[PDB]
Amino acid sequence: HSTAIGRVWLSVIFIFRIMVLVVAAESVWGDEKSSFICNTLQPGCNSVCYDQFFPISHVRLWSLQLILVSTPALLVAMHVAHQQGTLWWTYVISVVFRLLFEAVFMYVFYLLYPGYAMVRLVKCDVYPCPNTVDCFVSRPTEKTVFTVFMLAASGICIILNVAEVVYLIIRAC
Amino acid sequence: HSTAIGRVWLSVIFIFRIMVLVVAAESVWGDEKSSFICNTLQPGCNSVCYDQFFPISHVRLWSLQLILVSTPALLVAMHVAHQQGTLWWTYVISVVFRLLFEAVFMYVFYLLYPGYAMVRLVKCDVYPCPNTVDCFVSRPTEKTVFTVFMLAASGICIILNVAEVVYLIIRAC
Amino acid sequence: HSTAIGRVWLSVIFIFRIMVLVVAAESVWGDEKSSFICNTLQPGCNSVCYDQFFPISHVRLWSLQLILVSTPALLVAMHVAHQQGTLWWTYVISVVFRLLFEAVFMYVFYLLYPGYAMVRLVKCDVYPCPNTVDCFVSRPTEKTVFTVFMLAASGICIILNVAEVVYLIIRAC
Amino acid sequence: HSTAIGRVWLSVIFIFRIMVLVVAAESVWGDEKSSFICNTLQPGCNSVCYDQFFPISHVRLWSLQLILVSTPALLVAMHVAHQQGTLWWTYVISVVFRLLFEAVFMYVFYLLYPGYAMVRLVKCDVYPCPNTVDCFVSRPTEKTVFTVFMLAASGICIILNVAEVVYLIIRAC
Amino acid sequence: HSTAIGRVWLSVIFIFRIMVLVVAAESVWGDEKSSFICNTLQPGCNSVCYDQFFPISHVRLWSLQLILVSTPALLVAMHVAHQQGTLWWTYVISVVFRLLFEAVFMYVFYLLYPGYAMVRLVKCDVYPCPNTVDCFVSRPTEKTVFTVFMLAASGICIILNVAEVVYLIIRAC
Amino acid sequence: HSTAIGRVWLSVIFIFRIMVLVVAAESVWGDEKSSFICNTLQPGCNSVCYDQFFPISHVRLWSLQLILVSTPALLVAMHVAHQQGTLWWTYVISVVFRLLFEAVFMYVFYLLYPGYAMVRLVKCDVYPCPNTVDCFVSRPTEKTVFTVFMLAASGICIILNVAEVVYLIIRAC
């Protein structure tokens, strides 16, 4: 029932995000916290500083995004298999929710990590760490590269979803 | 035999909980105890303080909940395959037990963790740790985010199960 | 050839034990010995004290129990597939051996771990540890919770197997 | 083409050895060398003492044994599938080689580990460790229990293979 | 629709790259950063020096390359399955993009790692490491061997893709 | 199209090498470098000495050998499936290349590791390690046993491949 821009391109880009996330989950972000060390001798400051600068990691943000993005698609597949009416409205609503999930997660990424580029050193000033301590991020450049790849793919998904809605509206009218 | 509110929505939400739990099991809670350190030099206080504040972890609580929730569904599938009567009563009983398991595990979550928000620092006062020691939770914010997601999905399951019972009762009458 | 009490309930409970054991194997008991530390500075006392108090871990005891319990079931399936007589006697013998394996492993659990509740601190007095040393068990409460779940499921299996034998005897007579 | 004593019992026991070995490979013998510590401060003596007392571990000895035992069975299956004559001689030869592999590996186990019972402490006197040092085996009792299970299953395989040869000879004559 | 030089040789070489990358991902590059130590006592200099000399690791560069190389192939397969016109132009465009991805990633490898040979010692001069510190690469020779294998396979892919384009053009004309 | 000596024996031996390599990859060679320690206090000498004495590990040498050995077999399978002429010449060429790969990798094993027997202690004299330092190999005897098994299987493959060529030549003439 889908048009060519979402049947082929959107599915392939989604598979691309799946494969990239799987590669970068255990490998790039495997030692995100274990190798996250701070210049201070205060016990327990590695954990609090890591949590302060990484409230939720990129992989798990992308993992949650991919699950949320695929949820309307899973709903349609579950709904179609059980019904088998006007399923066109159901599909366009699912695409709209998919677009909203992409936009929301991209905006969440902007809020959580202002500036899509990891930095080697982060200035951590939180209890119990005295004054400001220097904590070092594991693989900042590698994480930045995969962040650019995932964000670019997400932006492509946003554009493709918008084109999907426009194409379906034009098809209806 | 199920209605639309449980055939599609409840199944999709259950799959959502499965995928989120799988993502958050090895990744978020992988280093829950290894990186759980306390400010004291007393040997063995990391283990006792972790056990005191985490009698059972969220992932394993959710893992047990998902197994328990799916158990009445597994019973019906096993019963139907072997019988192949009035299976409607069997299904509604399974839904009621599924609702009870969701409510019980949510209440257990309330008892074990009063306040659905991890804190960076926990005040541990237990033998052999002298007086009160400061122990630090690994990824408190990330665990809090996944706790909110899982609890929200569980609440949706509770609402959907209640709607399932009401819809079936209305269908019968 | 089986009756309803073992065809459905016993199989589901067995699957429940499988899923719970898989969840609790790598997660709960993954760091049973690595995080098992003692208050003494004597080298090698962590290993000997862990072995003294845990001659065989609960997961491996349950893993061996599940393999042993499923062995008569595997024998019948292997025997039936190769024969395809009076297979009723073969089935009831397999159920009896399954019941005996459940009872033996439960009794073994009683002998190895008198008192089905882990304790945070264990008093270890064994060579080369001088006098008595304080060793700390990893996740004592979480292991206790899963021990209760597994033992309760095993007790249900014992009751269901006894009911299976009684039902088959009543059916024959 | 096989008789009942090897078609059912031998196959089930082989599956039992497979399942037990898989359970005991990553779990029991996972930390065989990492947690193998010696009482000396001499660097590198943990490795040489572990190698001296464990030239080849039980799991890998059993893993090699299971591969070798299944090799004549794999040869027959490969030979039959490609031929599809007097395959009875081929089968009995495979059983004889299977029996020889079981006996050889059991004898190898006797030579490598005289006395089928792990000991907590081993007296290591090898370069560069000065004089005799005390090294501690990880999970000696748990490894002993699984050693007894595997050796008992191997002995059952030896008896079943001998019965297989005798039954086939009686069938021929 | 493909000719023999790409249907057989290109596919086999791609499978060769997949298998080699899988073997060398967890094994060779598993401890790339954990065992990457520097001669300095400055905290956090292992991470910054590793990132400076390895902005993105070879395995993840190859993993991204393989995903990108297979993307036009995945697009054609997705497009063909949904269409089922002049698909010859679509295929040759996919081959051209595949060739460009191979060339771009090979050039990226040249830029990121000038000189396709790992060195045991790297001179790291970056904040906060004082002056120049000596950092040691894990398995430099083994990584060099797999780098040569992967680059040689990539060069073969480039040559085969060029031959694919030439053969198709000759076939058309 | 293959004769009996390569259809059955060569395939079974190849499967034997696959299973042995899989068993010995994560288990025997899992801690090859992590537990490779040297008697010196010079930082970074564990890595350089390990690389000096193990330019490429046995498992990865065998993994590359198995991929290379199976490559001509994969080429024939890919070629046959796409053609479906004189495929006999193609098969014998593949066998010859398979024999050459076996011989080349065995000779490479001789060059990289002169003497097919691991030694507990290796005399490392390389920068920055001062003079000659004593480094200890992890599981030298266990690695030696698996080296003998793999080399013996490789020698059997060489003999079987030579017999395959001779048998095919005799069949043609």
Numbering used by the authors:
A (entry chain A), B (entry chain B), C (entry chain C), D (entry chain D), E (entry chain F), F (entry chain E): 16 to 99, 129 to 217
Article, verbatim:
Connexins are transmembrane proteins which assemble into hexameric hemichannels (HCs) at the cell surface allowing the exchange of small solutes (ions and molecules of molecular weight below ~1.5 kDa) between the cell cytoplasm and the extracellular environment. Two HCs at the surface of the neighboring cells can dock in a head-to-head fashion, forming gap junction channels (GJCs). The GJCs connect the cytoplasms of neighboring cells and ensure their electrochemical and metabolic coupling in a process called gap junction intercellular communication (GJIC). There are 21 connexin isoforms in humans, with distinct tissue distribution, channel properties and regulatory mechanisms.
Addition of MFQ to Cx32 GJC did not alter the overall conformation of the channel, with an RMSD of 0.447 Å between the Cx32-apo and the Cx32-MFQ. The N-terminal helix (NTH) remained unresolved, similar to the Cx32-apo GJC structure. However, an additional density element was clearly present in the pore region corresponding to the previously described lipid-1 site. We interpret this density as the site of MFQ binding, and thus this region of Cx32 is referred to as “site M”. Upon addition of MFQ, the only change in Cx32 GJC density occurs at site M. This density is large enough to accommodate the quinoline part of the molecule. However, there is no clearly defined density which fits the piperazine moiety of either (+)-(11R, 12S) or (-)-(11S, 12R) enantiomer of MFQ, both of which were present in the sample. As accurate positioning of MFQ is not possible, we modelled the MFQ based on its conformation in a complex with Cx36 GJC, for which a high-resolution 3D reconstruction is available. The site M is formed by I33, L36, V37, A40, E41, S79, and I82 of one subunit, and M34 and V38 of the neighbouring subunit, and is thus largely hydrophobic. Likewise, MFQ binding to site M decreases the pore diameter only slightly, concomitant with the changes in the electrostatic potential of the pore. Mutagenesis of V37, a key residue located in the site M, renders Cx32 HCs and GJCs insensitive to MFQ-mediated inhibition.
